[PDB]
Write a protein that binds this ligand. Structure first.
Ligand SMILES: *[C@@H]1O[C@H](CO)[C@@H](O)[C@H](O)[C@H]1NC(C)=O
Ligand SMILES: [Ca+2]
Ligand SMILES: [Cl-]
Length: 496
């Protein structure tokens, strides 16, 4: 469950948050395959509540109605078409599996659902699954409200309703089997793995029992006996009884400390400084690298109220965000996920964004196509961070340097740092309020290298900065604090 099942030499996943299946299929073919991306995390592909107050929020997709593959992203045939097309170009699909819960207990009964299935939260009736009252934790939860009230009680965190979401009775073989039926439908379609949503709200052993029911990956595309990649969304920032290590026997875990701390460092909050990153990884209290799914931001915490709060860097913070993403993609810790977002009219009142619910770009609730501009950016309010030169080129950097050790660290005791990845890549950052001009040991073979942040290697030339590595492995780097991107990255495949 720990291996991503990407092609060898492809080392990241991208979250194409709220994208439609047909757009992901096209993106696999036209961009993700040629640019070296390992795979795509898709939004939940199962039927959810259609919520109209407020209007079609992103978070309606975390309120299941059934396991029909029928959502605003598309129907089952469209989902299968995407998985097939992506697998056929060697780009994997990972499903966001919403399996802890059904919808909010106070949602009105009816057919306000993305496939029109009937459901009745108040009577616990989800006939399109089917689930009934026997399949929820009403009787097991011991809190006075029926909801999670106190995260210091690890039992109620698992047995009670997360902000009122009806909590499935995951100890029951019937329920485990309905979840496995859904997940095996997806595996047999060709998905390579899963994000397990709300994993802190499930017992490790119930997750294990579900995983024990799962198939190996579809043998038309994957070697025999390949296990689905599992990454469990466990928010563990310390200071609560639940530890993400309890989940290591099932798969990887999301390491939310990663982006929280990287954000604080890059923002220079509380005296933190990039020079402190020399021992980034387990030295910062993180999970073992081989159990980590890492990211700068995710779809929930990029809205400011998630794990990490205001420290999280996002596309709105583009300059610092590119630096953070670049550090992540250069550093060997973890398996990396890049975010790809949509723009919304963020409107802070009293320090909080009142429009943080807004769903994906849409016309009357129908999600807009992703259009591609001549300059390779996206239209229709899709941000497409994964197409930013500085991010895409660092996705490639990570591939190029795969397996190479962290080495040749330098820092100035403040926020000018650099390091290499064996003899295959080198990266230099200036997050101080002055220039960084110094000759550094790069570990690379002598030659001329294109900086892949300011430019590209195209037609045997560099379009941006060029770095000259001498026979001693040293090269001079100059980065003004006024530079568009105050970091430089070079690697074996950017050498002229
Ligand atoms: C690189 O750029 C120079 C200057 O524009 C040009 O003469 C040359 O043809 C380009 N390509 C190579 C491979 O040198
Ligand atoms: Ca639960
Ligand atoms: Cl996540």
């Amino acid at each position: 469950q720990y291996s991503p099942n990407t092609q060898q030499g492809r080392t990241s996943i991208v979250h194409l948050f709220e994208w439609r299946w047909v757009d992901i299929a096209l993106e696999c073919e036209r961009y993700l395959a040629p640019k070296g991306f390992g795979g795509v995390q898709v939004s939940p592909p199962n039927e959810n509540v259609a919520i109209y107050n407020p209007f079609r929020p992103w978070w309606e997709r975390y309120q299941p109605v059934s396991y029909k593959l029928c959502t605003r992203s598309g129907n089952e045939d469209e989902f299968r078409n995407m998985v097939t097309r992506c697998n056929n170009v060697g780009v994997r699909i990972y499903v966001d599996a919403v399996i802890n819960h059904m919808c909010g207990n106070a949602v009105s009964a009816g057919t306000s659902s993305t496939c029109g299935s009937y459901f009745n939260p108040g009577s616990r009736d989800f006939p399109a699954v089917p689930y009934s009252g026997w399949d929820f934790n009403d009787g097991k939860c011991k809190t006075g409200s029926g909801d999670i009230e106190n995260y210091n009680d690890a039992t109620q965190v698992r047995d009670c309703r997360l902000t009122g979401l009806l909590d499935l009775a995951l100890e029951k073989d019937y329920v485990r089997s309905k979840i496995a039926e859904y997940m095996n439908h997806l595996i047999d379609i060709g998905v390579a793995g899963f994000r397990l949503d709300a994993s802190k709200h499930m017992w490790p052993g119930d997750i294990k029992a579900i995983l024990d029911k799962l198939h190996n990956l579809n043998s038309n595309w994957f070697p025999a006996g390949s296990k689905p990649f599992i990454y469990q969304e466990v928010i563990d920032l310390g200071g609560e009884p639940i530890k993400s290590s309890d989940y290591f026997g099932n798969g990887r875990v999301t390491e939310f400390k990663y982006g929280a701390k990287l954000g604080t460092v890059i923002r220079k909050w509380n005296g933190e400084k990039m020079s402190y990153l020399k021992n980034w990884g387990e030295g910062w209290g993180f999970v073992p690298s081989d159990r980590a799914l890492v990211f700068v931001d995710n779809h929930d915490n990029q809205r400011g109220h998630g794990a990490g709060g205001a420290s999280i860097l996002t596309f709105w913070d583009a300059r610092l965000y590119k630096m953070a993403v670049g550090f992540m993609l250069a550093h060997p810790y973890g398996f990396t996920r890049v975010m790809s977002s949509y723009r919304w009219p963020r409107q802070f009142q009293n320090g909080n964004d009142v429009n943080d619910w807004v769903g994906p770009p849409n016309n009357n609730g129908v999600i807009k196509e992703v259009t591609i501009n001549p300059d390779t950016t996206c239209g229709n309010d899709w941000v497409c961070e994964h197409r930013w030169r500085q991010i895409r080129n660092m996705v490639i950097f990570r591939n190029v340097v795969d397996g190479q050790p962290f080495t040749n660290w330098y820092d100035n005791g403040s926020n000018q740092v650099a390091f290499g990845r064996g003899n295959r890549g080198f990266i230099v950052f200036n997050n101080d309020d002055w220039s960084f001009s110094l000759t550094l040991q790069t570990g690379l073979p002598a030659g001329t290298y294109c900086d892949v942040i300011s430019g590209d290697k195209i037609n045997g030339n560099c379009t941006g900065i060029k770095i000259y590595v001498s026979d001693d492995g040293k090269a001079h780097f100059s980065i003004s604090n006024s530079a568009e991107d105050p970091f430089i990255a070079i690697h074996a495949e950017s050498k002229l």
